[PDB]
Every structure is written in C-alpha cells, then in structure tokens.
Amino acid sequence: YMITLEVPARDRSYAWLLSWLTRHSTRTQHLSVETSYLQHESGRISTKFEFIPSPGNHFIWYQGKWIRVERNRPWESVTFTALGTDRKVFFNILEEARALALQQEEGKTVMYTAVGSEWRTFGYPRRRRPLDSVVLQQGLADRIVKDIREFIDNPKWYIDRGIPYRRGYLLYGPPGCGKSSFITALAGELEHSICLLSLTDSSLSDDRLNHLLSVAPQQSLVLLEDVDAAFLSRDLAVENPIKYQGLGRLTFSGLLNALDGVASTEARIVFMTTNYIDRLDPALIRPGRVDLKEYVGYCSHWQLTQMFQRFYPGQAPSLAENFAEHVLKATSEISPAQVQGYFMLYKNDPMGAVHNIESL
Amino acid sequence: YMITLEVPARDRSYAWLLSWLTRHSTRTQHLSVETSYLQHESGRISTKFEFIPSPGNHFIWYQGKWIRVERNRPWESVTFTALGTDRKVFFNILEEARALALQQEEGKTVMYTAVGSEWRTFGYPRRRRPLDSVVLQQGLADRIVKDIREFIDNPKWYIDRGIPYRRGYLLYGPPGCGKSSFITALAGELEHSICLLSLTDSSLSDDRLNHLLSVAPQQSLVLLEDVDAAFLSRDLAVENPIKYQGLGRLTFSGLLNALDGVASTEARIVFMTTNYIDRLDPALIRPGRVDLKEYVGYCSHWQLTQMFQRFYPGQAPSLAENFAEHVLKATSEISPAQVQGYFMLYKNDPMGAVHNIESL
Ligand SMILES: Nc1ncnc2c1ncn2[C@@H]1O[C@H](COP(=O)(O)OP(=O)(O)OP(=O)(O)O)[C@@H](O)[C@H]1O
Ligand SMILES: Nc1ncnc2c1ncn2[C@@H]1O[C@H](COP(=O)(O)OP(=O)(O)OP(=O)(O)O)[C@@H](O)[C@H]1O
Ligand SMILES: [Mg+2]
Ligand SMILES: [Mg+2]
C-alpha cells in the first residue's frame, strides 16, 4: 500500500519537475553527463562536468522519506513513488519546483514551439530586448501598448455584453523596418511568452491547429509569421477558391474558422506579420479576426534623429539634426536596418558618420 | 463467479463514468497528477494540485462493496468488476454519473467533434451567448426560432403522411454579418449541442460520413462550415462533373446521398453556411435538403439603433437615431463587425462615438 503519482510527458509542470530533479541530483547512483564548454583562446576550453540524473529509479532523500523517482524512455512518463498515503510531500515538491523554475525565468522571455499537437520550450530563456531600444514612428508603440493593456485590464466589459474575449493585431511594411524586433520588445515589456507557429508545416491540420490554439499556455502571445506565403489569393479568388499552395494538410476555411469561429477559445492574443498587404484575402483581415492593423515604413526625420541619439549617447543635439538632414537629402527612402548597419561601420566614432554619408 | 461489466471507449456514458471516477478518486493507491494554474501577477501562479485516478486497478469503496475498476491503455476499455451477481450497483453508478455530469453542463453548450468515425467532446463546455446580444434584421431570428420549434414539436404530422423527419437550413451573406454568432446563440437558446463537421478533412469518406450522420448525439445540431469551398461547381458543371478540389476521399454524389437519400436517418437538424450563394450546385440546395434559406446582410437603420442601445444602455433614444443617421449618411454599406470594433474603441464613452464617426 503506497502512493504512485504518475506525471506523463504532456504536463505543464513537466519542465518544473525536471529542473527540480536536476537540482536534487545528489544521492543518485545512476547519472547522465552534464558537461558544457566555454572557449576562451589558445585551445583552452573550460569544462563544466556535472550530473543530470539519468532516466532511472534514483532514490531521493527529500525530507528523509526515501522517495523513489522513475523516468522511463518516444514516450516519457515520470513517476514519484512514496510511502503510505500522505500527498503533502507531492505538494511541497511542486511548490519548490515552481519556486525554482520561476526564479530562473526572471527578466527573460520563454519561447515555445509547436511539437506534434502540443507546446514545448525551445532552448534556454532569451534575454529581453528593451522597448525603447526599438524606435518606431512618433506615437505608434504607445498606441499598441495602451490598446493591449486596455484589452488585458477589461475582461468584465467583454462578458457583460457577450462579445468573445479575443483580440488580434497585424503588422505590415517593407522588409527591414522593425516588425519582429517590436514584437519581441512588446513581449518582453508585457512579461508574456512567445509561441511560434508556422502555417507551412508538413504536420499541421485543421484539428491540430484548433487543438494548438485551444491549449496555448496562459500569459502568452501567439505569433503567425508571413501569413501571405501560406495562401495565394486575390487574382486566384476571382476565378477559383483559395488554394493552399504548400506542403501540409491545411485549408483556408479551416484557418478562418480556427482564428474566429464557433469553437474558438477565450483570452487569446494573436500577432500576424506580412510584407504584401494586398495579397491577403479580405475575409481573413476583417474586424473580429484582426482588430488593429498598423503600417511600419521607412525612416523619417524624427526616427533618424532618435536613432542617432541612441547609438551615440552624450552627443550634442545639433549632430542628430545634421545627420537627419544629410540622410534625407542624399536619399529619399531608407530602412532602419541600413542605418543600423551604417552606424555599426563607425563604432564609437561620432562626427565620422556625419561626414561619410555617401550611401546612395 | 463474479460480474465483469465492460465499457469500451465507444460509449455515450464514457464521459459520465470518467467524471464519476474523478469524483470518487479517494482511496486509490495509484494516481495521476491534476494540477492547473491561474496566473494573477508578479509571477505568482496559483497551484491546484489534485488527483485524477490513473489507468489502474484502483479498489473503490462505493457502498462498502470493494468495487474494482480497471482502465487499460490507442484503445481504451474501462472495466467495473464486482462481487456475485447483483447488477444494482451498476444502475446506481450510472445514475450518479448522469446526475453529476448533467449538473456540470447547466447553462452551457457542449461542442462535439468528429474523431475517426465517432463524436467526441472538444474541451470544457462553453458559456452560452444570450440571443438578444445578437442583433439581426427585423423579424428574422423570430422566424427561424418559430420554424425550428414547430419542426421539433410536430413529429406526429411527419409520420402520419410519410415524409422523412428531417430539416436543414442555409445561411449566406457577406463576411462578418452574424452567421456563426447567431448559430451559437440559437444553439444556446434551444439547449442543444453543436457538432462540428469539416468536409475537407483528410480522413473522410462516404461510408464514414454516413456513419457520422447516423450516430450523431441526440438533442444536437450538425454544422457544416463553408460548403462551397469543398466543391468547385457551376462553370465546371457546364462541361464536366463536379470535382472535389482538395484533400480527402469524398465525392459530390456521396455527400448528396448522405444529406438526403435512402439510408438517411431521422430527427436530424443540419445547418450550412457559405459566403458565395452562386457557387453552390442547384441539386445541393433543393427543397428536402435545405428547407429554409436566409440572407444576412449589411447594417440598416434599425440594426444600428439596436446595436447602439445595446452597447451603451441607459442612453436617451435620440442618440441612437443620431448615430444611425450619421453612419448611414457617411457610408452606405457597413458590416456589424466594424460597428462592434468602432464601439470597442470608445469604451464607456457615449457622446464620444457620436462625434468621431469618420470611418470611410
Ligand atoms: N525601428 C528600428 N529601430 C532599431 N533597430 C531596428 C529597427 N527596425 C529594425 N531594426 C534592426 O534591424 C534588424 C532586424 O530587424 P527586424 O527583424 O525587426 O526587421 P523586419 O522589418 O521585421 O524584417 P523582416 O520583414 O525581414 O522579418 C535588427 O538588428 C534590428 O535591431
Ligand atoms: N448582428 C450582429 N450583432 C452583434 N455582433 C455581431 C453581429 N454580427 C457579427 N457580430 C460580431 O462580429 C464578430 C464575429 O461575427 P461572426 O463570426 O458571427 O460573423 P460571420 O458573418 O459569421 O463571419 P465569417 O463569415 O467570417 O464566419 C463577433 O464579435 C460578433 O459578436
Ligand atoms: Mg522579422
Ligand atoms: Mg463565422
């Protein structure tokens, strides 16, 4: 007579338990190697040999209980066998795992991915990009931030009238203007998590897409990159239905219903990005599916001035005006990425980038 | 000499027994983790650790009978082994499961889905949308409600003359007018259940479609979304037979016979939705397969007035007339979804949406 807690692979606290188990690797006869390397120079690579507990029956001595944990071997099922019937030690283990895991993810952003029909983490947590480091047009980031915050802070008003509690944003513009960078900065600012979804995958279907959109982690953003490339439309729409034009078992109607239909879930934010606004079917970007659409474009006077004052702090304000005037006189349109590269050429050299502005 | 009740996966009361078993999880040596999370803020996520009984041979103490329940492990078969030959405990268990399950589904709508050749539930029951929250044209929802109620309440008249006891409705219009929302509201009002069916699935055939249409749950609605996209027609029909145009092993004649043929079942309601009424073959929408067809269109004066008086309750009636007049003068055609979004911009701000009506 014992208690055999069974936690299979498909669990939210799976990573938390794995992290705690790696933390409590002491007193474990079976091990797995945990070496990592940091090269410095001269062929002297630092070693960091450690011990991940192997998928075995290691006996743990938590609170003097001789707890036995077994991880099997692609299907995985972790087991926490104990003595008697207490259930308190399980709660303590879960709480300690939560305390340890959330401590690790502090000041970072966790990136998930779509594996099969489920979300799994993708690498170590990434360092968040400061929001002010991304410079957009005057009064554009503030509007999006305010709209998202208002949507988050008013759930009652949605329920009191019956509208589904959902939202969606679309960003479009020329290549190299700040779409992905702004999305990353916003995710870092809002302390959310990014879920990456590809519509051209070879293992995605309508039912799997609906399940993925239904089981998305809480306090997270869903990102759809280049929705146009997954469905040719417009000129085709005048003659025949919208073909899928790719590899994967997906249909236009399935995606349309999944984004906003009858079985769509609640409390979800979806971001979409494209480079050809005119290649998107009108039914896809109608209100209800895309509440706010914004255009990010080429540089302007204020944007160039802010970029200059950001890359060379401490300089006099006249230099920024000189740089902006010269850039806008020498060329008409320019992308922020090109300006960033040109600045990267002249590292820590103010008044040097104000002279060699020949980039026609 | 015992009694071994066997209930495989393909049963209607399967969910009821699973819910009862989760209710009676006490005195079970083997367990499975039942933790859920509700984020609040500051990285403080509430834990709800519980215990779903694992697929094991847990010994239950219902009525002091030492009942043994075993769930195997994709094929599933639940077993209720008991002592002697009584069969009374089985009646009591089924009745308690029914009492518990129907208690949970109160005021909600259950959404089913097509898995293989059987209907299975899809997530938690969803909150029902009030019917008055969806505003359609004058005297349109009432007609459909009355027709459906008349069909439900008169089975004798159908039998006494020999007509098959079936019905079907079709809704068509511009994208973003209220088709799906009205269907959801009607399903909530009628205390029915929604079954989602996709005609472009990669595992659908004529025999499977017939089986699914024959085994649909009682007191339920069958929904076919975007029937046009599954069969190109019209201009093709003038030259060659109807092609399927997609992925899946289905034919036009198979669908036509399944909807209304010789083997079609009785007491079934089917809803169909499309955006291009002119792309549907005449044989598909003939009487007998689609009894009532209705058109949902753009906004009108009364619809706009009702929407305004719904989103801002307590306002004077003149404001609604002013808003309707200004909207209809500034623009001719406008979808209700755009009106909903424009109202969503001005939250709790009457007399503000009556001034900034520039949405051309
Ligand atoms: N507004 C901006 N301010 C600062 N850096 C920017 C800005 N826009 C782009 N960059 C820089 O350009 C590089 C890539 O930008 P990013 O990937 O966000 O562009 P994009 O417009 O989303 O491109 P693509 O459409 O090809 O995905 C990064 O080094 C990023 O810092
Ligand atoms: N008549 C209406 N009254 C109130 N809200 C409406 C109405 N029509 C649409 N909406 C709102 O529009 C949004 C989506 O509407 P819905 O999905 O029902 O439109 P649809 O015409 O069925 O669209 P699609 O053809 O793309 O499926 C929801 O927020 C819903 O509340
Ligand atoms: Mg990018
Ligand atoms: Mg709809």
Author numbering:
A (entry chain D), B (entry chain C): 47 to 119, 131 to 417
Q: What sentences appear in the manuscript?
A:
The human AAA-ATPase Bcs1L translocates the fully assembled Rieske iron-sulfur protein (ISP) precursor across the mitochondrial inner membrane, enabling respiratory Complex III assembly. Bcs1L is a membrane-bound oligomer, with each subunit consisting of an N-terminal TM segment, a middle Bcs1-specific domain, and a C-terminal AAA domain that is highly distinct, forming a clade of its own in the broad AAA protein family. Here, we captured Bcs1L conformations by cryo-EM during active ATP hydrolysis in the presence or absence of ISP substrate. In contrast to the threading mechanism widely employed by AAA proteins in substrate translocation, subunits of Bcs1L alternate uniformly between ATP and ADP conformations without detectable intermediates that have different, co-existing nucleotide states, indicating that the subunits act in concert.
Further 3D classifications to look for different conformations yielded only two distinct conformations, with 3/4 classes (322,765 particles, approximately 95% of the selected particles after the 2D classification) resembling the ATPγS state with disordered TM cavity (ATP state-1), and a minor population (5%, 15,083 particles) resembling the Apo/ADP state. Using the best class of particles after 3D classification (class 3 in pink), which contained 200,466 particles and did not give detectable tetradecamer signals, the map was refined to 3.77 Å resolution with C1 symmetry and to 3.13 Å with C7 symmetry. Global superposition of the refined mBcs1L-ATP heptamer model with the reported model of mBcs1L with bound ATPγS gave a rms deviation of 0.644 Å for 1,743 aligned CA atoms with the ATP-bound Bcs1L slightly expanded in diameter. In both C1 and C7 maps, the nucleotide-binding sites are exceptionally well-defined in the density, with local resolutions estimated at 3.5 and 3.0 Å, respectively, exceeding the global resolutions of the reconstructed maps and providing confidence in the assignment of nucleotide state. The AAA ATPase regions are very much the same, but they differ substantially in the TM region and the Bcs1-specific region when compared to the ATPγS-state and to each other. The Matrix-seal in the ATP state-1 has the widest opening, as the β-sheets I tilts further away from MIM and the seal loops become too flexible to trace in the density map (middle). The conformation of β-Sheet II in ATP state-1 is partially extended with the density at the tip being less well-defined (top). In the ATP state-1 conformation, both Matrix-seal and IMS-seal are open transiently, allowing passage of ISP-ED.
